[model samples]
Target: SKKIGLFYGTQTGKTESVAEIIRDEFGNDVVTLHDVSQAEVTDLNDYQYLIIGCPTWNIGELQSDWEGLYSELDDVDFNGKLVAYFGTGDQIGYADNFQDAIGILEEKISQRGGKTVGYWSTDGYDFNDSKALRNGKFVGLALDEDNQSDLTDDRIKSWVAQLKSEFGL
Candidate 1:
C-alpha cells in the first residue's frame, strides 16, 4: 500500500490538476489519489499520511463535494496521521478569500488530532485576505488557476518535495 492517500474535490478539474501534479511528483508507489466526491470517510484510514485538497468557491466556501463530506471529515479520526492540504482559488476573483478552503481543512484536521505539514509561504501571492494565512504563511499549498495558472506546476513540485521530506518518504 502507498504511504499517502491524496483526496481532492474539484468543480472544474482545476483542483484535480493540482492533485495530479502532486501524484506525478510523488509517483504511484508513494501516493494514491481519491476524488472526495465518491470517497468514503473510511478511505482516509488506510494511510498514515494524507493530502486533502479542495477549491474555495464563491466567497470562501468548500467545494460542493467536500461540503457534502463535511460531517464525515469530522467523523474520521486523525490521530497519528500527518495531513497536508492544497487548495485552488482565484486570487483576483476572490481576493478576500483566496485559498481559504485550506485553512478550513486545517482547522478541521487539527480538531481531530491530525498534525499538518507542508505550509507554504505567502511571498509570491497578492491577495487581500485568506483564512489559510497563519503567522504569515498559508496553512498549505495554495494554487490560483484563474489568475496565476503558470505557477501551479512549480508550486506543486516544491510542495511535494517538502512533503516528501516532512513525511520522510
Candidate 2:
C-alpha cells in the first residue's frame, strides 16, 4: 500500500472539508490528513504522494500558513515524491485572480523537486484570469464551493480516479 500525505492550510475551514473527502476516498489505512499549520514539517517526508490544499487569500496571495510551509518544505528532499494540489477560490467574484494559491504551491514544491501531476482543466470555471493556469489548464483541481458547490463531489471523485492512475500509489 502506498503512504499518502494530505496537507492543507485553510482560513474559513473549507479546504479541510475537501481534504477529509480526499482522505476518506483513499481510506484511512492509506491516507493521513494534516493541517499543515499545526503539523511538523518533518512528518511529511515519508509519503510517496503528497496532496496539498490551500485557500486563496487577499487577491491571490497564498493561504497564510501554506505560505510558510513552502520555506520549511524546501529544507527536505522530496526527489521521488509526487505532488498534487487542490484548492478553493472564488471564480466569479474574484475572477481576475482565482485559485492562484494552488499554482504557488505547485511552484514551491516543483522547486523542491517534487514531480507535479493532476493538472486540471479550466473548462467549467467562469474565471477570467488566474496565476494558477499553466499550459491552458489549472495547476491542480480548482474548487469554487461558494458558487459551484454542486460540482465538488463529482470533481473530487473524478480527480481521485485520475490521481489513482497518475500517482502509481
Candidate 3:
C-alpha cells in the first residue's frame, strides 16, 4: 500500500482548504494533515509521497511555524519520494512575493531528492480591476471563469493520473 502525507501551515485557512481538495480527489492514498507547528519528524523513507501547503508570509517567507519545521527537514533523506506543494496569498499585490513560501518549500524538497508531481501555479489573480472584494475583503483580481475552469483541466488531472500510474494505485 502507498502512503501519502499532507502537511500544511495556514494562517487564514486557504492553504488548508487546498490541501483538503487534494485529499478529496486522491481518495485511495493514505493522507495525514499536520499543523506545521506540531508536525513530527518522520522517516521519509517510509512514505512514497509528500504534499505540503503554506501561505506566503512577509516578503514571501514561509510562515514562522514552517520556518521551524523546515529546519528539521534538512536531515531527512527523501531519495525517491514524490512531492507537491500549494499556497495561498492575498490578491491585493500588497505582498511582492505572494508565492515565496511555496517556492522555498519546493526548492528544499527537490534538494533533498523529492520529485514534484506538477508545476506550481497561483489562483485568485484578477487583473482587470485594480480592486475587488470577496465577502467585504480585498481579493486581488479573482481568476476569471475561464481561468478558474482550468484548475480542473487536463493539465492538472493528467498530473494526478501520472502519480496514480507511477505508483500503480
Candidate 4:
C-alpha cells in the first residue's frame, strides 16, 4: 500500500494518540503527518486513501482546530479519493451526540464526490443516537475513551481489516 493521509483534530492529545494508532494499523511506513489545523495542505490529492479524525465536543461541535480547517476542504478537489473516517467521543457523557464528528466529516466527504467506506455497526455502543448513523449504521469507527478504552485497539483492528478490502491506497 502507498502512504495514506491521516488528518486529525486533537484537543488534549487523546485524539492525537488515537490518530497514530490508526496510522500504525494503516502502516507507519505508509502514513503522513496531518494536523487538521494546517491551512494549506501540500499534495493532498496525491493521497489515494485519506482517513480523517476529529473528537466531538460542545453539543456536537468539532474539535477547535477543525472549526478553522474545515473550510479548507472547499479548496481541495477530491475527485477520486477513497475516504474513511474515525472519531473519539464520550458515549456515556455525550450520548446524545456520540461520535457526531464522524457524521460531520461524512458530510464533507460527500461533498468531495469520492468513495467513502468504513461504516461501523452501532450494536456495540450504548449511545442514544448519532447523526453519524446512516441506514442504521455508524459512518465510521468510533472510540469512547471516556468509557471504553480497552476496546479501542480491537475496534480499530477490526475496522481496518474491513477497510482493507473495501478501500485501496
Best by lDDT: 1
Per residue, candidate 4 scores C-alpha lDDT tens digits across 53-133 of 889989898898887767677777778788888899998888899988879877886787767789888888998978899
Instruction: Flag regions of model 4 displaced more than 4 Å.
Output: 27-29, 39-43
Q: Which whole-number lDDT from 0 to 100 does residue 19 have in model 1?
A: 84
- Winner on TM-score between 3 and 4 is 4
**Which model is ahead, 2 or 3, in terms of TM-score?**
2
In angstroms, how far off is 154's CA in candidate 3?
10
lDDT of 4: 0.82
Which candidate do you rate higher for lDDT, 1 or 3? Answer: 1
User: Which has the better TM-score: candidate 1, or candidate 2?
Assistant: 1
Ranking of candidates on TM-score, top first: 1, 2, 4, 3
- In order, the Cα lDDT scores of the candidates are 0.88, 0.86, 0.59, 0.82
For candidate 3, report its TM-score.
0.70
For candidate 3, write residues 17-37 as lDDT tens digits. 666666666666667776776
| Tens-digit per-residue lDDT, 1-169, candidate 1 | 4378998999999889788888888864567889988998888889999999999987988999888887777778889999998998988778898988889888988899999899999998989999999899999998888888899888888888899889987
Give the lowest summed-lDDT range of ten residues in model 4.
37-46
Which should have the higher lDDT, number 1 or number 4?
Answer: 1
lDDT (C-alpha) at residue 164 in model 3: 65
Task: Report the Cα lDDT for residue 148, model 2.
Answer: 97
Error of 2 at 82 (Å): 0.5
TM-score of each: 0.95, 0.94, 0.70, 0.91
